[PDB]
Amino acid sequence: IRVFDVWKKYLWVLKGINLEIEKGEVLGIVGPNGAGKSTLLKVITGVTEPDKGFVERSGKVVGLLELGTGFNYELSGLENIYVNASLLGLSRREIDEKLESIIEFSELDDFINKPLKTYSSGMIMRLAFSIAIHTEPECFIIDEALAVGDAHFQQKCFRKLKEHKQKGGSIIFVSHDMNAVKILCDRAILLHKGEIIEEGSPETVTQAYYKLK
Amino acid sequence: IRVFDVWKKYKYYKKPQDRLKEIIFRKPFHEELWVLKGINLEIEKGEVLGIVGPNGAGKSTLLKVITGVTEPDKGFVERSGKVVGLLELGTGFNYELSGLENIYVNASLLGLSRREIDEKLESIIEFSELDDFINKPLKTYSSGMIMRLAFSIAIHTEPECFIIDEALAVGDAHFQQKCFRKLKEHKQKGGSIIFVSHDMNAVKILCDRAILLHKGEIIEEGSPETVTQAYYKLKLHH
């Protein structure tokens, strides 16, 4: 939710970053690839510790880095659901309530017992999406590379995202399509060399990015 | 390159519980299923071959035997040179290491020599378009930059065949074209490419010929029109 004066070095990747993601919000993060967007998201999700300052988050954040974490291909898809969902914080009771819905979402009911090694690359993405979309995290990190291979599958993923937004979820959108930002994002921010140059409505930020572009 | 009488099986426990019960009773309590049955195939240098089929047909397990990650239970596969696939892309990367340092381990694992790395090192870093960040460690790299780097190392190792699933290579179209241009250069240089997709239109235009894989066997093979037609005939009678 809230990022307060967070700093990260290795040179400082992030300098004086203050940010807040409110509930029910679709937030777009735009900038050069070299600006350090990945390091900013990692401090948010919590995989990277801020060198100076702090960030407080109400709940877990799910991003591409988390997606499909801990998968073991020797294990079955059904077995893999448990290990992935457990790493994402779902309780044993929660998994069983959602195991039925997760399998129906992936549409792998025929193949779910089969071990992951046999699955096609598309099937694995479909499975990891199903586990991730159901963990009910407070925030979702959506890079444009996500949602690839959607035989209308994106619509089911997109429909749950509307449900997630209505339930107080927050979404972070990482993409280079500014037009997409206006359509999906309630507000956006532009990141340059570890600092936020301009923030606000997606129209204002899209203008500023074009000024930089 | 050449796949002869390849067969591949796996254990199929009905319930996760049953994996326990087989420990207790000392008896197997699994199901043996064959991903690939009677797979005979040839890949000619300078060929774009399309592998189309249902997800269960076994394409992933078949591609994995070709790349060399999995050994066939029955039959054999012979390849003249290395094959690069999604599992290989960025294999062995350590994010704590620098982007330049990580290049060395990937190429060393992909078989490139210390001398071989250096000759093409200039173009590869210029190919990735990562200039100041090359000194920087991978952890700072964006997901795009990491994938962008991994493609760059793999695309120039000049393996005999490239396996391209359609979901793979997604990204900046301008960089995807850079990969597309190099693959055309790869084909001209005697390279062979394998195209895996559910887009028949993509298969028909790009693939010189194709095979249809269903239930672990090739039901129809040949010109892309016939195979794409055959794939439609298969979808009717299911």
3-state SS of chain A?
Answer: CEEEEEEEECCEEEEEEEEECCCCEEEEEECCHHHCHHHHHHHHHCCCCCCEEEEECCCCEECCCCCCCCCCCCCEHHHHHHHHHHHCCCCHHHHHHHHHHHHHHHCCCCCCCCEHHHCCHHHHHHHHHHHHHHCCCCEEEEECCCCCCCCCHHHHHHHHHHHHHHCCCEEEEECCCHHHHHHHCCEEEEEECCEEEEEECHHHHHHHHHHHC
Contact A33 B142 (CB under 8 A): yes
Contacts of B137 in chain A (CB under 8 A): 10
Cβ-proximal residues to A195 (8 Å cutoff; 6+ apart), any chain: A15, A16, A17
- Distance in angstroms (rounded) separating the CA atoms of residues B121 and B152: 10
Residue-wise over A20-54: b if at least 16 C-beta within 10 A, else e?
A: ebeeebbbbbbbbbbbbbbbbbbbbbeebebeebe
Whether residue A213 is annotated as binding a ligand: the answer is no
Closest Cα in chain A to B133: A34
Would you tell me the crossing angle of helices B143-156 and B114-128 to the nearest 10 degrees?
A: 130
Which amino acid is located at B2 in the chain? R
A76 touches chain B (CB under 8 A): yes
- Residue A34 assigned ligand-binding role: yes
The residue in chain A having the minimum alpha-carbon distance to the alpha carbon of residue B165 is A121
Residue A10 assigned as binding residue: yes
Contact A162/B at CB under 8 A: no
Burial of B30-40, coded b for 16+ CB within 10 Å and e otherwise, reads eeeebbbbebe
Cα separation of B101 and B68, whole Å?
26
Q: Which residues in chain B are contacts of A33 at CB distance < 8 A?
A: 142, 144-145
- d(C-alpha A75, C-alpha A116), whole Å: 6
Phi first, then psi, for residue A61 (nearest 5°) are: -120, 130
Q: What is the DSSP letter of B154?
A: H
Best B70, B132, B142, B149 member to test A by mutation, with max A CBs in 10 Å, is B142
Residue recorded with tokens 């490139």: B112
Give the three-class secondary structure for B167: coil
Q: Residue B100 is inside which H or E element, if any?
A: helix B99-109
Residue tagged 């990650």 (tokens): B69
- Strand ranges across the sheet with B209-214: B83-84, B161-165, B192-196, B48-52, B209-214, B217-222
Q: Which residues, including other chains, have CB under 8 Å from residue B218's CB and lie 6 or more apart? A: B39, B40, B41, B211, B212
Which residue of B10, B136, B141 is in closest CB contact with A118?
A: B10
Whole-angstrom Cα distance, residue A172 to residue A41?
9
Q: Can you list the alpha helix ranges (DSSP code H) found in B129-191? A: 143-156, 173-188
Residue A197 near residue A190, CB atoms below 8 Å: yes
**Single-letter amino acid, residue B49:** L
Report CB contact under 8 Å: B13, A76. yes
Element (H, E) at B205: helix B200-206
The full length of chain A comes to: 213
Distance from C-alpha of B72 to C-alpha of B63, rounded to nearest angstrom: 12
Contact check, Cβ <8 Å, A13/B140: yes
Q: Are the C-beta atoms of residues A202 and A187 closer than 8 Å to each other?
A: yes
Q: How many CA atoms lie within 13 A of A107 on its CB side?
A: 12
Q: Give the three-state DSSP class for B217.
A: strand
Q: Distance between CA B216 and CA B235 in Å, rounded?
A: 16
Report in angstroms the alpha-carbon separations of A151 from A155, A175, B47, B125, B135. 9, 21, 28, 36, 40
Paired tokens of B111: 């078989």
Cβ(A177)–Cβ(A201) below 8 Å: no
**Interface mutation target, options A113, A120, A129, chain B, most CBs of B under 10 Å:** A120
Residues 6+ apart with CB under 8 A from B45: B1, B80, B160, B190, B191, B192
CA distance B87 to B135: 25
- Smallest CA-to-CA distance from B39 within B21, B58, B22 is with B58
Q: How far is CA A175 from the centre of its chain?
A: 12
Q: How far apart are CA B161 and CA B45, in angstroms?
A: 8
* Structure-determination approach: X-ray
Instruction: Residue count of chain B, please give it.
Output: 238
Cβ–Cβ gap A64/B168 under 8 Å: no
- Residue A23: phi and psi, rounded to 5, are -70, 155
Q: In Å, how far from its chain's centre is CA B183?
A: 14
Q: Which residues pair with B50 in a beta bridge?
A: B195, B210
Shortest distance between the Cα of B227 and any Cα of chain A, in A, equals 20
**DSSP conformation class of B132:** S
**How far apart are alpha carbons B48 and B63 in whole angstroms?**
14
User: Are A121 and B86 within 8 A, CB to CB?
Assistant: yes
Sign of CA dihedral B147, B152, B154, B159: positive
Q: Nearest-CA residue of chain B relative to A110?
A: B56
The whole-angstrom separation of Cα A150 and Cα A158 is: 11
The gap between the terminal CA atoms of chain A, to the nearest Å, is: 29
Helix (H, G, I), strand (E, B) or coil at B19: helix
CA distance B152 to B128: 6
| The amino acid at B58 | G
Assess contact for B204 and B225: CB atoms under 8 A.
Answer: yes
